[PDB]
Amino acid sequence: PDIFNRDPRDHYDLLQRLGGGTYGEVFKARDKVSGDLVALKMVKMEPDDDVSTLQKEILILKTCRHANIVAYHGSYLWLQKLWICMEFCGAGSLQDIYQVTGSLSELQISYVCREVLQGLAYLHSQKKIHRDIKGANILINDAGEVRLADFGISAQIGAELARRLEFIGTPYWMAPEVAAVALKGGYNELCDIWSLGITAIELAELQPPLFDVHPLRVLFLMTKSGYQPPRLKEKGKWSAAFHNFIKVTLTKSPKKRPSATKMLSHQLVSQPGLNRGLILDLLDKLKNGNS
Amino acid sequence: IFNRDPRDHYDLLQRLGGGTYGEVFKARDKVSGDLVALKMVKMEPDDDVSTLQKEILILKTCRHANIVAYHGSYLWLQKLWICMEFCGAGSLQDIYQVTGSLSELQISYVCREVLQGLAYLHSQKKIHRDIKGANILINDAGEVRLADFGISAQIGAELARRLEFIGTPYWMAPEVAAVALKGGYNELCDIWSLGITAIELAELQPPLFDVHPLRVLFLMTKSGYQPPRLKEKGKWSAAFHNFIKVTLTKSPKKRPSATKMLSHQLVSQPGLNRGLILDLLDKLKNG
Ligand SMILES: O=C(NCCCN1CCOCC1)Nc1cc(F)c(Oc2ccnc3[nH]cc(C(F)(F)F)c23)c(F)c1
Ligand SMILES: O=C(NCCCN1CCOCC1)Nc1cc(F)c(Oc2ccnc3[nH]cc(C(F)(F)F)c23)c(F)c1
Ligand SMILES: O=C(NCCCN1CCOCC1)Nc1cc(F)c(Oc2ccnc3[nH]cc(C(F)(F)F)c23)c(F)c1
Ligand SMILES: O=C(NCCCN1CCOCC1)Nc1cc(F)c(Oc2ccnc3[nH]cc(C(F)(F)F)c23)c(F)c1
């Protein structure tokens, strides 16, 4: 039973629409038997869509499991709607949170990075790459725990897939090496480490470096040989350990960039007192105001 | 570049083709009466005129017969207009959808002319990236033209979709950004696309056209992927089959350059001239 030939409403009560976009529509839902809350992401099928083309991605969702990545519970197909059942994270993304609370403290950031590195260490051990580590893809549940998410299978099916294929010119005239890039090859898992460094600056300053610079110009600057990796803006606000964490994750050459396991030994994420309590404090601020 | 309304200098005749990524108009020059093609691209304030300003200068400077001629550009009302050589017969896809499949000689001539344009583009360190029947243009003289669209891809909707589908740069590692910038490949991709296009012109569809496109991408990734071939063996000469085999070389490090392919028997033979395509246009117009 790769995908359930069942209406998910037979098993779940939809409670609330949490959001919707190109990634699909996401609902808060309650298991009818256990009473557990879940998130249901629904993707609308096109007339030509073929769910069998998702077989290998579904196998990965079934076999990859870790506390720090959003838990996959199953998939349903019914009346041209594809549903993915996932762990529920009631506080949304860290981007959703800091847009209300303001910048996180160093210790909150240190806790987040540790939890993200644990997830990434597992993914990399399974020879997978996240590819899109950022505040918007790090979810927080009401217990203060941290879970990696992604854009999701919506990019592999539905109207989003159709829009992407139109953009690349379809694949029929495409050379093999181009096809490899279109499936997001050409680089390795250490890109996630750099992305985590940028995310730590994002949690500290409310935007990644150069966010006020045109994206094309950033691309131009990033690939010049003289490019200087970014740094935290305010020096005295952050400890040497935090500055050094930014220094070593944002290593330009991938051959010299530390792995997720090596980073988990870093002073910043190895220090005592990192626990979900730090995020419970943030969630109180989010719900009730600073005072 | 001109900071005027282009309609000051041209009369719009009719809309030839629109879409998400541009609109093309048939127009006539006021002072000279010449027919032209105008491609309108919508711009953003969030767009960057510095980058396109530099790309403008290249086209303004460098020519080739098999490249659609650049005549001028206009920025007005956040709309970029590019004035180009007008090709009265449209694309080869517009033609063969009416005429049926092309003869080997006609395909040989098309491939020669496309290779000449490619050899030139690659010498300018450019990549066409979208070689196919729909982007090979034909004028009423039966000549073959390629469109250089490099400018459009870094402004307007094309840039926005790129940022959306490939991603913004701000969280990218430098090695990832470098792939996102150039697409992550080389100019020999155009040589593969031309081999497919030759099959397209011979059979009215690229190989695997009836197969789900994602599945097609998956199959191309497999280690034992077999490059396509012409369906009907006996209908085509050995030179044509060898042309296909050589252009559809799996490894880019063994795929021949555009210049090397102009040495190939198929595109080297005498008798290849625009009269072959005049014959195709006559069939288009009459029965
Ligand atoms: O819609 C937003 N924010 C809008 C911001 C508006 N702004 C206000 C301020 O100004 C600017 C605009 N966030 C958001 C929406 C979702 F549907 C999320 O999905 C989930 C939710 C809960 N549990 C989950 N478990 C797995 C998922 C998965 F779907 F992601 F996989 C998931 C999610 F995480 C975040
Ligand atoms: O790797 C692929 N496909 C191969 C494509 C590249 N090939 C090689 C290169 O060239 C082309 C082909 N899919 C994939 C990989 C992952 F690591 C995923 O991560 C998870 C798994 C299970 N549960 C999860 N919960 C949250 C996640 C989150 F990590 F996504 F956040 C998550 C996932 F969902 C899918
Ligand atoms: O741009 C062109 N050719 C010329 C322009 C054609 N246009 C057609 C429409 O109208 C205007 C002309 N080819 C092209 C564009 C892409 F974006 C590609 O994809 C990537 C590359 C690197 N990293 C990636 N990550 C995710 C992708 C995903 F896009 F595949 F999802 C992706 C790709 F492989 C080839
Ligand atoms: O839109 C179509 N046909 C649609 C048919 C609908 N289909 C029927 C079959 O079934 C499905 C639907 N043809 C077409 C439109 C254009 F605007 C072209 O652009 C030009 C034209 C003339 N001179 C030019 N000079 C530079 C250009 C450049 F704009 F391309 F750069 C250019 C072009 F070449 C062909």
Curated annotation (Swiss-Prot), chain A:
Share the record's PTM remark.
Answer: Autophosphorylates: phosphorylation promotes ubiquitination by the Cul7-RING(FBXW8) ubiquitin-protein ligase complex, leading to its degradation by the proteasome. Tyrosine-phosphorylated after activation of hemopoietic cells.
- Reading the lineage from the top rank, the first entry is Eukaryota
Annotated tissue distribution = Expressed primarily in hematopoietic organs, including bone marrow, spleen and thymus. Also expressed at very low levels in lung, kidney, mammary glands and small intestine.
* Residues covered by the Protein kinase domain: 12-269
Q: Where is the active site?
A: 132
Which residues are reported to carry the modification Phosphoserine?
166
Q: Quote the record's binding site residues for ATP.
A: 18-26, 41
Give the Phosphothreonine positions (modified residues): 160, 170
Give the protein's function: Serine/threonine-protein kinase, which plays a role in the response to environmental stress. Appears to act upstream of the JUN N-terminal pathway. Activator of the Hippo signaling pathway which plays a pivotal role in organ size control and tumor suppression by restricting proliferation and promoting apoptosis. MAP4Ks act in parallel to and are partially redundant with STK3/MST2 and STK4/MST2 in the phosphorylation and activation of LATS1/2, and establish MAP4Ks as components of the expanded Hippo pathway. May play a role in hematopoietic lineage decisions and growth regulation.
What family does the Swiss-Prot or TrEMBL record give for this protein? Belongs to the protein kinase superfamily. STE Ser/Thr protein kinase family. STE20 subfamily.
Q: Provide the assembly information.
A: Interacts with MAP3K1. Interacts with FBXW8. Interacts with CLNK (via its SH2 domain).
Q: What is this protein called?
A: Mitogen-activated protein kinase kinase kinase kinase 1
Q: Which residues of the full protein are shown?
A: 6 to 293 of 833
